[PDB]
From a paper:
Coronavirus 3CLpro is a cysteine protease that has two N-terminal domains containing two β-barrel chymotrypsin-like folds. The active site of 3CLpro is located in the cleft between the two domains and is characterized by a catalytic Cys-His dyad. The polyproteins are processed by a 3C-like protease [3CLpro or main protease (MPro)] (11 cleavage sites) and a papain-like protease (PLpro) (3 cleavage sites), resulting in 16 mature nonstructural proteins, including an RNA-dependent RNA polymerase (RdRp). X-ray crystallography confirmed the mechanism of action of the inhibitors, which involves formation of a covalent bond between the active site cysteine and the carbonyl carbon of the aldehyde.
Next, compound 7j was cocrystallized with SARS-CoV or SARS-CoV-2 3CLpro, and the structures were compared to that for MERS-CoV 3CLpro and 7j. The electron density map for compound 7j in complex with SARS-CoV-2 3CLpro was most consistent with a single enantiomer, although it adopted a similar binding mode and hydrogen bond interactions as observed in the SARS-CoV 3CLpro-7j cocrystal structure. Compound 7j was cocrystallized with MERS-CoV, SARS-CoV, and SARS-CoV-2 3CLpro. Superposition of compound 7j with these 3CLpro enzymes revealed a similar binding mode among all three proteases. Compound 7j had a moderately lower potency against SARS-CoV 3CLpro and SARS-CoV-2 3CLpro compared to MERS-CoV 3CLpro in the FRET enzyme assay, suggesting that moieties forming H-bonds that were accommodated at the S4 subsite had an important impact on potency. The compounds were also effective against SARS-CoV-2 with EC50 values ranging from 0.15 to 0.9 μM in Vero E6 cells.
Residue numbers in the entry:
A (entry chain A): 4 to 301
B (entry chain B): 1 to 302
The structure:
Amino acid sequence: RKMAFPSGKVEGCMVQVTCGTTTLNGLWLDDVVYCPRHVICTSEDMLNPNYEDLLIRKSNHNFLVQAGNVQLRVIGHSMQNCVLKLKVDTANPKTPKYKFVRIQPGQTFSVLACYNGSPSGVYQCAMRPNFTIKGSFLNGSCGSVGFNIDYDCVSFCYMHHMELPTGVHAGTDLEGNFYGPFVDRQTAQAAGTDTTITVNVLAWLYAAVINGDRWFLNRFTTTLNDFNLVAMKYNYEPLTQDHVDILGPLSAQTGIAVLDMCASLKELLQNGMNGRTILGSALLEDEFTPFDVVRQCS
Amino acid sequence: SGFRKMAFPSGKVEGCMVQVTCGTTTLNGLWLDDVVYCPRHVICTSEDMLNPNYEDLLIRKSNHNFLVQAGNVQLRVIGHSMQNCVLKLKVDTANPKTPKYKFVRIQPGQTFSVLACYNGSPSGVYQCAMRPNFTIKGSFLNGSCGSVGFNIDYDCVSFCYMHHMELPTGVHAGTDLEGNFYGPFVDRQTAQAAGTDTTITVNVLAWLYAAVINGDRWFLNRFTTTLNDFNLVAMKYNYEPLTQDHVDILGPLSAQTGIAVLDMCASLKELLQNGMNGRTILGSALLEDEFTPFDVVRQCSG
Ligand SMILES: *[C@H](O)[C@H](C[C@@H]1CCNC1=O)NC(=O)[C@H](CC(C)C)NC(=O)OCC1CCC(F)(F)CC1
Ligand SMILES: *[C@H](O)[C@H](C[C@@H]1CCNC1=O)NC(=O)[C@H](CC(C)C)NC(=O)OCC1CCC(F)(F)CC1
């Protein structure tokens, strides 16, 4: 089961930010609201926006920030890469313990999808190898955030900025740097060739074994390098020795050596699944990490 | 592709989760106003689990036997009663985080969010579909009982599920918040069989409407059917028969696409009888049955 983190600590931070006729979401931590800087653009700016030039011309009173029924007074603003930081006169009392992190491709995070500053859904996503995410984001979702929770600390890793023509999504970390080669201008942008997160597929196969599903296993083994040759042929990410180590606990628990599971996955890539399904799925799932699988077995 | 299982934000429910302990048995409870709701089998020992005498077990209990805690803070119990398979513990403090709420009993095919909890602490949130045999495919471990399933409409939380047990096949069973089990199950430590599962027809039809909304409509044909005729055919392919309520909840998607429900039923009947023929719908040769008409509207139209 693809499981998201409980979203309560993040819901208490979502606000609505408006400039002119553009409305999106902001993240209110302490006395600062973070949001995508493209809220300051008009239609006639969106194609090549000189954001520093646009921002020096804005006044504090041009930003309308609403937390529920309350308006928050903006008392200063600055820009950090693609994120606007609005200083407000009030501290958010619901601010959790938090940090800002930049996640690696193949890592997963929960998305709290918001519209008009109101949370609407929560779901799990992975940072794709090509630095897109396969999200569910509609108009007005910008400023929705992705996060992980460790103990009582919320680690914010993603803020939503745009959709690509293929229907996948792109955004930044909370320092405002995009993941991937994307730019916050209103243009049709393609991503690099995506690849499949091999260590995650292996984690998921182990999960299927842990739940009594093992039709895809076989008697064979493979070397790491020979596996990686076939993996790259099928546009799967290479498996590193650190990946093999990370899979150690699932390997121990199931009694199935990592390179044995690699030989199972090699068979599935070359032979297909031929009708069969694994954990309900007709496709190999690659948005469960080893940690995710273990968190949900313990 | 295009669609994913999306849960409701869990914060309003997180603010109601507590733990309820009898002896060394700890499970989760739901604290709303000055009442805590939880599975009655918290009052059981292992010697009593094969066929507990819940009525006698409850007479032996007093208020001071129940440890209710929000985090590490004890909530004093001032009354107790049993309603079907749920224990209702009156407490001396009204939960200040109580949302607007209602208790609803859902129908098979309906989806809901589960906030999986252990020792009163949330671990994760995910969407579940109530199968036609009244089981769900949850991710529940020991200590998860009392976790709840819910939907959120406006600012109102509709609680529909409380978790009680696992079946030999690995699926899960539970009650509504009035303590009435979904399906033929009972809260005893015994092996119980779920009915053979079937495919959720109304959700498959929702999925076909979703495909049409997205411009994927090769499968629409020029014919219609009666509901009875479709139901008789559908049963032969292990699809659930449609109810009048199912026809009604497809109303909004029917109006959005202009395709009458019974016309879509005729298109589905042809897929069942003739198969996909190596074709796909929304990228898959498999028909999805875990997205309700409401789920589809939420993700197509927001
Ligand atoms: C912010 O709410 C919004 C979110 C997207 C709208 C629909 N789904 C989304 O995720 N973001 C934007 O509108 C950006 C703003 C730019 C200044 C970055 N633009 C955008 O996402 O454009 C969408 C594509 C659609 C296809 C296309 F070819 F026309 C090019 C742009
Ligand atoms: C409450 O936390 C717990 C939840 C289950 C533990 C593991 N996964 C779960 O969903 N519920 C129980 O332990 C119930 C208690 C009874 C009084 C209802 N018992 C139970 O779920 O038993 C599981 C079955 C498994 C198949 C079997 F044949 F072995 C018979 C017992």
